[PDB]
mmCIF file of all heavy atoms in Angstrom:
data_model
loop_
_atom_site.group_PDB
_atom_site.id
_atom_site.type_symbol
_atom_site.label_atom_id
_atom_site.label_comp_id
_atom_site.label_asym_id
_atom_site.label_seq_id
_atom_site.Cartn_x
_atom_site.Cartn_y
_atom_site.Cartn_z
ATOM 1 N N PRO D 13 146.534 113.187 34.832
ATOM 2 C CA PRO D 13 145.878 111.996 35.401
ATOM 3 C C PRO D 13 146.717 110.736 35.289
ATOM 4 O O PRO D 13 146.546 109.811 36.095
ATOM 5 C CB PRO D 13 144.576 111.890 34.593
ATOM 6 C CG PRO D 13 144.752 112.789 33.415
ATOM 7 C CD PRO D 13 145.686 113.865 33.840
ATOM 8 N N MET D 14 147.623 110.674 34.310
ATOM 9 C CA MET D 14 148.559 109.557 34.238
ATOM 10 C C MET D 14 149.434 109.499 35.481
ATOM 11 O O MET D 14 149.739 108.411 35.988
ATOM 12 C CB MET D 14 149.417 109.677 32.979
ATOM 13 C CG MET D 14 150.563 108.683 32.907
ATOM 14 S SD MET D 14 152.124 109.460 32.453
ATOM 15 C CE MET D 14 152.649 110.123 34.030
ATOM 16 N N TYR D 15 149.851 110.663 35.986
ATOM 17 C CA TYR D 15 150.639 110.695 37.213
ATOM 18 C C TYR D 15 149.851 110.127 38.385
ATOM 19 O O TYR D 15 150.396 109.371 39.192
ATOM 20 C CB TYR D 15 151.094 112.122 37.519
ATOM 21 C CG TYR D 15 151.960 112.233 38.756
ATOM 22 C CD1 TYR D 15 153.340 112.123 38.672
ATOM 23 C CD2 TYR D 15 151.396 112.444 40.008
ATOM 24 C CE1 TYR D 15 154.133 112.217 39.798
ATOM 25 C CE2 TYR D 15 152.181 112.536 41.138
ATOM 26 C CZ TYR D 15 153.549 112.425 41.027
ATOM 27 O OH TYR D 15 154.335 112.521 42.150
ATOM 28 N N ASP D 16 148.570 110.482 38.496
ATOM 29 C CA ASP D 16 147.752 109.958 39.586
ATOM 30 C C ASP D 16 147.546 108.454 39.456
ATOM 31 O O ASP D 16 147.565 107.732 40.460
ATOM 32 C CB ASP D 16 146.411 110.686 39.629
ATOM 33 C CG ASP D 16 146.549 112.128 40.064
ATOM 34 O OD1 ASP D 16 146.782 112.992 39.192
ATOM 35 O OD2 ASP D 16 146.428 112.400 41.276
ATOM 36 N N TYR D 17 147.344 107.964 38.231
ATOM 37 C CA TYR D 17 147.209 106.525 38.022
ATOM 38 C C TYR D 17 148.479 105.790 38.440
ATOM 39 O O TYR D 17 148.427 104.800 39.181
ATOM 40 C CB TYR D 17 146.874 106.245 36.555
ATOM 41 C CG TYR D 17 146.193 104.918 36.288
ATOM 42 C CD1 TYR D 17 145.614 104.653 35.054
ATOM 43 C CD2 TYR D 17 146.127 103.932 37.263
ATOM 44 C CE1 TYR D 17 144.994 103.449 34.799
ATOM 45 C CE2 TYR D 17 145.512 102.724 37.017
ATOM 46 C CZ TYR D 17 144.943 102.489 35.784
ATOM 47 O OH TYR D 17 144.324 101.288 35.537
ATOM 48 N N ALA D 18 149.636 106.269 37.981
ATOM 49 C CA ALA D 18 150.888 105.614 38.344
ATOM 50 C C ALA D 18 151.154 105.725 39.840
ATOM 51 O O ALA D 18 151.682 104.791 40.454
ATOM 52 C CB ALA D 18 152.042 106.206 37.537
ATOM 53 N N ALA D 19 150.780 106.854 40.448
ATOM 54 C CA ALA D 19 150.985 107.038 41.878
ATOM 55 C C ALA D 19 150.125 106.084 42.693
ATOM 56 O O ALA D 19 150.600 105.501 43.671
ATOM 57 C CB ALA D 19 150.693 108.488 42.264
ATOM 58 N N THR D 20 148.856 105.912 42.317
ATOM 59 C CA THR D 20 148.017 104.977 43.059
ATOM 60 C C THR D 20 148.451 103.535 42.823
ATOM 61 O O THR D 20 148.344 102.705 43.732
ATOM 62 C CB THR D 20 146.536 105.175 42.716
ATOM 63 O OG1 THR D 20 145.732 104.398 43.611
ATOM 64 C CG2 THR D 20 146.228 104.754 41.297
ATOM 65 N N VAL D 21 148.974 103.223 41.635
ATOM 66 C CA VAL D 21 149.519 101.886 41.410
ATOM 67 C C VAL D 21 150.733 101.650 42.303
ATOM 68 O O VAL D 21 150.882 100.578 42.903
ATOM 69 C CB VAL D 21 149.853 101.690 39.921
ATOM 70 C CG1 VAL D 21 150.707 100.452 39.724
ATOM 71 C CG2 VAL D 21 148.575 101.583 39.114
ATOM 72 N N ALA D 22 151.611 102.649 42.412
ATOM 73 C CA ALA D 22 152.767 102.530 43.297
ATOM 74 C C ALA D 22 152.341 102.409 44.754
ATOM 75 O O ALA D 22 152.947 101.657 45.526
ATOM 76 C CB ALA D 22 153.697 103.726 43.105
ATOM 77 N N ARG D 23 151.307 103.154 45.152
ATOM 78 C CA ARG D 23 150.795 103.058 46.513
ATOM 79 C C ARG D 23 150.248 101.667 46.799
ATOM 80 O O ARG D 23 150.455 101.122 47.889
ATOM 81 C CB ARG D 23 149.714 104.114 46.740
ATOM 82 C CG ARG D 23 150.198 105.343 47.474
ATOM 83 C CD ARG D 23 149.317 106.539 47.185
ATOM 84 N NE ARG D 23 150.103 107.755 47.021
ATOM 85 C CZ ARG D 23 149.588 108.970 46.902
ATOM 86 N NH1 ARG D 23 148.282 109.172 46.924
ATOM 87 N NH2 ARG D 23 150.405 110.009 46.757
ATOM 88 N N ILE D 24 149.536 101.083 45.834
ATOM 89 C CA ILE D 24 149.067 99.709 45.983
ATOM 90 C C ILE D 24 150.252 98.764 46.128
ATOM 91 O O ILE D 24 150.266 97.879 46.991
ATOM 92 C CB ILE D 24 148.173 99.315 44.794
ATOM 93 C CG1 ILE D 24 146.829 100.035 44.873
ATOM 94 C CG2 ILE D 24 147.970 97.809 44.751
ATOM 95 C CD1 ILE D 24 146.154 100.201 43.535
ATOM 96 N N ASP D 25 151.273 98.948 45.290
ATOM 97 C CA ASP D 25 152.470 98.120 45.356
ATOM 98 C C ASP D 25 153.372 98.466 46.534
ATOM 99 O O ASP D 25 154.303 97.708 46.820
ATOM 100 C CB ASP D 25 153.260 98.238 44.051
ATOM 101 C CG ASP D 25 152.643 97.436 42.923
ATOM 102 O OD1 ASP D 25 151.595 97.859 42.394
ATOM 103 O OD2 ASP D 25 153.206 96.383 42.562
ATOM 104 N N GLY D 26 153.123 99.581 47.216
ATOM 105 C CA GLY D 26 153.903 99.949 48.380
ATOM 106 C C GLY D 26 155.204 100.663 48.099
ATOM 107 O O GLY D 26 155.993 100.858 49.029
ATOM 108 N N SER D 27 155.459 101.061 46.852
ATOM 109 C CA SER D 27 156.703 101.746 46.525
ATOM 110 C C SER D 27 156.727 103.190 47.005
ATOM 111 O O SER D 27 157.812 103.769 47.126
ATOM 112 C CB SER D 27 156.948 101.703 45.016
ATOM 113 O OG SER D 27 156.824 100.383 44.519
ATOM 114 N N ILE D 28 155.570 103.783 47.276
ATOM 115 C CA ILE D 28 155.500 105.143 47.807
ATOM 116 C C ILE D 28 154.561 105.141 49.005
ATOM 117 O O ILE D 28 153.708 104.249 49.140
ATOM 118 C CB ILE D 28 155.037 106.156 46.732
ATOM 119 C CG1 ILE D 28 153.655 105.788 46.196
ATOM 120 C CG2 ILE D 28 156.048 106.242 45.602
ATOM 121 C CD1 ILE D 28 153.019 106.885 45.376
ATOM 122 N N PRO D 29 154.706 106.113 49.907
ATOM 123 C CA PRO D 29 153.812 106.174 51.068
ATOM 124 C C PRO D 29 152.359 106.343 50.651
ATOM 125 O O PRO D 29 152.045 106.983 49.646
ATOM 126 C CB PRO D 29 154.315 107.396 51.843
ATOM 127 C CG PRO D 29 155.721 107.571 51.406
ATOM 128 C CD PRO D 29 155.767 107.133 49.977
ATOM 129 N N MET D 30 151.467 105.753 51.448
ATOM 130 C CA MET D 30 150.045 105.773 51.132
ATOM 131 C C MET D 30 149.443 107.169 51.223
ATOM 132 O O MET D 30 148.358 107.397 50.678
ATOM 133 C CB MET D 30 149.290 104.823 52.061
ATOM 134 C CG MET D 30 149.159 103.410 51.526
ATOM 135 S SD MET D 30 147.955 103.283 50.191
ATOM 136 C CE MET D 30 146.445 103.066 51.125
ATOM 137 N N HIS D 31 150.112 108.100 51.890
ATOM 138 C CA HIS D 31 149.618 109.459 52.053
ATOM 139 C C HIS D 31 150.207 110.376 50.988
ATOM 140 O O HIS D 31 151.242 110.087 50.384
ATOM 141 C CB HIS D 31 149.961 109.993 53.446
ATOM 142 C CG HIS D 31 151.417 109.910 53.781
ATOM 143 N ND1 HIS D 31 152.337 110.839 53.340
ATOM 144 C CD2 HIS D 31 152.115 109.007 54.510
ATOM 145 C CE1 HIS D 31 153.537 110.511 53.784
ATOM 146 N NE2 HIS D 31 153.430 109.405 54.497
ATOM 147 N N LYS D 32 149.523 111.494 50.759
ATOM 148 C CA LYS D 32 150.063 112.518 49.884
ATOM 149 C C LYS D 32 151.274 113.175 50.544
ATOM 150 O O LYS D 32 151.340 113.280 51.771
ATOM 151 C CB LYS D 32 149.003 113.569 49.564
ATOM 152 C CG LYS D 32 147.586 113.030 49.524
ATOM 153 C CD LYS D 32 146.622 114.051 48.941
ATOM 154 C CE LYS D 32 145.872 114.793 50.034
ATOM 155 N NZ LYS D 32 144.938 113.897 50.765
ATOM 156 N N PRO D 33 152.255 113.609 49.750
ATOM 157 C CA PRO D 33 153.475 114.177 50.335
ATOM 158 C C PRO D 33 153.178 115.400 51.190
ATOM 159 O O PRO D 33 152.335 116.234 50.851
ATOM 160 C CB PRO D 33 154.320 114.542 49.109
ATOM 161 C CG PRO D 33 153.774 113.719 47.998
ATOM 162 C CD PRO D 33 152.316 113.552 48.280
ATOM 163 N N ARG D 34 153.888 115.496 52.315
ATOM 164 C CA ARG D 34 153.767 116.626 53.223
ATOM 165 C C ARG D 34 154.974 117.549 53.199
ATOM 166 O O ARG D 34 154.864 118.694 53.648
ATOM 167 C CB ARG D 34 153.546 116.129 54.660
ATOM 168 C CG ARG D 34 152.631 114.921 54.750
ATOM 169 C CD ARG D 34 153.068 113.962 55.845
ATOM 170 N NE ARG D 34 151.937 113.231 56.402
ATOM 171 C CZ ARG D 34 152.046 112.175 57.197
ATOM 172 N NH1 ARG D 34 153.227 111.701 57.557
ATOM 173 N NH2 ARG D 34 150.942 111.579 57.638
ATOM 174 N N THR D 35 156.113 117.081 52.694
ATOM 175 C CA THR D 35 157.332 117.858 52.568
ATOM 176 C C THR D 35 157.810 117.833 51.121
ATOM 177 O O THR D 35 157.504 116.893 50.381
ATOM 178 C CB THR D 35 158.448 117.316 53.473
ATOM 179 O OG1 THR D 35 159.189 116.312 52.770
ATOM 180 C CG2 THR D 35 157.872 116.711 54.745
ATOM 181 N N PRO D 36 158.542 118.859 50.684
ATOM 182 C CA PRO D 36 159.082 118.834 49.314
ATOM 183 C C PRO D 36 159.977 117.638 49.035
ATOM 184 O O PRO D 36 160.016 117.166 47.892
ATOM 185 C CB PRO D 36 159.863 120.154 49.206
ATOM 186 C CG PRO D 36 159.656 120.890 50.494
ATOM 187 C CD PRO D 36 158.621 120.191 51.303
ATOM 188 N N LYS D 37 160.695 117.130 50.039
ATOM 189 C CA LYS D 37 161.604 116.007 49.814
ATOM 190 C C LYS D 37 160.828 114.766 49.385
ATOM 191 O O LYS D 37 161.167 114.118 48.387
ATOM 192 C CB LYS D 37 162.428 115.755 51.089
ATOM 193 C CG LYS D 37 163.641 114.784 51.027
ATOM 194 C CD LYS D 37 163.354 113.355 50.571
ATOM 195 C CE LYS D 37 164.344 112.364 51.166
ATOM 196 N NZ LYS D 37 164.098 110.983 50.659
ATOM 197 N N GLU D 38 159.769 114.422 50.121
ATOM 198 C CA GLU D 38 159.000 113.243 49.750
ATOM 199 C C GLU D 38 158.161 113.474 48.500
ATOM 200 O O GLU D 38 157.870 112.514 47.786
ATOM 201 C CB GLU D 38 158.127 112.782 50.918
ATOM 202 C CG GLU D 38 157.076 113.762 51.379
ATOM 203 C CD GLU D 38 156.251 113.198 52.519
ATOM 204 O OE1 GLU D 38 156.404 111.996 52.820
ATOM 205 O OE2 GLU D 38 155.455 113.951 53.113
ATOM 206 N N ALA D 39 157.795 114.723 48.200
ATOM 207 C CA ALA D 39 157.179 115.010 46.907
ATOM 208 C C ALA D 39 158.145 114.718 45.765
ATOM 209 O O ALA D 39 157.762 114.120 44.751
ATOM 210 C CB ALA D 39 156.708 116.462 46.858
ATOM 211 N N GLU D 40 159.410 115.120 45.918
ATOM 212 C CA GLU D 40 160.411 114.803 44.904
ATOM 213 C C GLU D 40 160.640 113.302 44.807
ATOM 214 O O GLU D 40 160.834 112.767 43.712
ATOM 215 C CB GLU D 40 161.725 115.527 45.203
ATOM 216 C CG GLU D 40 161.629 117.048 45.227
ATOM 217 C CD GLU D 40 160.592 117.598 44.264
ATOM 218 O OE1 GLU D 40 160.699 117.332 43.047
ATOM 219 O OE2 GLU D 40 159.669 118.300 44.726
ATOM 220 N N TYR D 41 160.636 112.607 45.946
ATOM 221 C CA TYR D 41 160.799 111.155 45.919
ATOM 222 C C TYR D 41 159.635 110.481 45.197
ATOM 223 O O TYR D 41 159.836 109.534 44.427
ATOM 224 C CB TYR D 41 160.937 110.608 47.337
ATOM 225 C CG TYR D 41 160.940 109.098 47.394
ATOM 226 C CD1 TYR D 41 162.049 108.374 46.983
ATOM 227 C CD2 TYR D 41 159.833 108.397 47.852
ATOM 228 C CE1 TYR D 41 162.056 106.994 47.028
ATOM 229 C CE2 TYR D 41 159.832 107.019 47.900
ATOM 230 C CZ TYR D 41 160.946 106.322 47.488
ATOM 231 O OH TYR D 41 160.951 104.949 47.535
ATOM 232 N N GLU D 42 158.410 110.949 45.444
ATOM 233 C CA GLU D 42 157.252 110.419 44.733
ATOM 234 C C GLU D 42 157.362 110.678 43.239
ATOM 235 O O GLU D 42 157.067 109.797 42.425
ATOM 236 C CB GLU D 42 155.968 111.033 45.291
ATOM 237 C CG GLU D 42 154.709 110.256 44.945
ATOM 238 C CD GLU D 42 153.446 111.083 45.106
ATOM 239 O OE1 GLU D 42 152.874 111.090 46.216
ATOM 240 O OE2 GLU D 42 153.023 111.722 44.121
ATOM 241 N N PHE D 43 157.794 111.883 42.859
ATOM 242 C CA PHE D 43 157.985 112.186 41.444
ATOM 243 C C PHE D 43 159.031 111.267 40.824
ATOM 244 O O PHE D 43 158.862 110.794 39.696
ATOM 245 C CB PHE D 43 158.386 113.652 41.276
ATOM 246 C CG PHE D 43 158.265 114.159 39.870
ATOM 247 C CD1 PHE D 43 157.165 114.902 39.482
ATOM 248 C CD2 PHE D 43 159.254 113.899 38.936
ATOM 249 C CE1 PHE D 43 157.052 115.373 38.191
ATOM 250 C CE2 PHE D 43 159.145 114.366 37.645
ATOM 251 C CZ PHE D 43 158.044 115.105 37.272
ATOM 252 N N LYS D 44 160.121 111.010 41.547
ATOM 253 C CA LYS D 44 161.159 110.117 41.043
ATOM 254 C C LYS D 44 160.632 108.699 40.866
ATOM 255 O O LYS D 44 160.937 108.035 39.869
ATOM 256 C CB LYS D 44 162.360 110.131 41.990
ATOM 257 C CG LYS D 44 163.457 109.140 41.640
ATOM 258 C CD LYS D 44 163.915 109.293 40.201
ATOM 259 C CE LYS D 44 165.106 108.399 39.908
ATOM 260 N NZ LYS D 44 166.378 109.010 40.381
ATOM 261 N N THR D 45 159.848 108.212 41.828
ATOM 262 C CA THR D 45 159.355 106.840 41.744
ATOM 263 C C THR D 45 158.250 106.707 40.704
ATOM 264 O O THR D 45 158.213 105.728 39.950
ATOM 265 C CB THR D 45 158.862 106.375 43.113
ATOM 266 O OG1 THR D 45 159.858 106.659 44.101
ATOM 267 C CG2 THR D 45 158.586 104.882 43.100
ATOM 268 N N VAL D 46 157.345 107.684 40.643
ATOM 269 C CA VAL D 46 156.205 107.587 39.737
ATOM 270 C C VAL D 46 156.641 107.820 38.295
ATOM 271 O O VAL D 46 156.330 107.028 37.399
ATOM 272 C CB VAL D 46 155.105 108.576 40.161
ATOM 273 C CG1 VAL D 46 154.063 108.708 39.072
ATOM 274 C CG2 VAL D 46 154.468 108.125 41.463
ATOM 275 N N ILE D 47 157.371 108.911 38.049
ATOM 276 C CA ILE D 47 157.776 109.235 36.685
ATOM 277 C C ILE D 47 158.942 108.362 36.243
ATOM 278 O O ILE D 47 159.084 108.056 35.054
ATOM 279 C CB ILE D 47 158.105 110.736 36.577
ATOM 280 C CG1 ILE D 47 156.853 111.574 36.838
ATOM 281 C CG2 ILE D 47 158.668 111.078 35.209
ATOM 282 C CD1 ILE D 47 155.610 111.046 36.156
ATOM 283 N N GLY D 48 159.779 107.927 37.183
ATOM 284 C CA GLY D 48 160.950 107.141 36.868
ATOM 285 C C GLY D 48 162.210 107.943 36.643
ATOM 286 O O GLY D 48 163.293 107.352 36.543
ATOM 287 N N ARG D 49 162.105 109.267 36.557
ATOM 288 C CA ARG D 49 163.256 110.145 36.431
ATOM 289 C C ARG D 49 163.038 111.369 37.305
ATOM 290 O O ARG D 49 161.901 111.763 37.575
ATOM 291 C CB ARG D 49 163.490 110.583 34.978
ATOM 292 C CG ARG D 49 163.777 109.449 34.013
ATOM 293 C CD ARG D 49 163.427 109.845 32.590
ATOM 294 N NE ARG D 49 164.182 109.074 31.609
ATOM 295 C CZ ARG D 49 163.650 108.505 30.537
ATOM 296 N NH1 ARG D 49 162.357 108.597 30.275
ATOM 297 N NH2 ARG D 49 164.435 107.821 29.710
#
Side-chain angles (χ1 to χ4, degrees):
Chain D
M14 171 227 81
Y15 182 90
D16 291 87
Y17 203 168
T20 189
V21 167
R23 260 157 220 187
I24 289 155
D25 283 74
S27 310
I28 59 167
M30 269 286 274
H31 54 81
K32 329 191 261 292
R34 321 144 151 168
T35 89
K37 191 302 208 183
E38 63 179 351
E40 300 328 302
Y41 173 74
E42 198 198 271
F43 195 100
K44 175 53 174 279
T45 310
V46 167
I47 296 317
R49 299 156 155 134

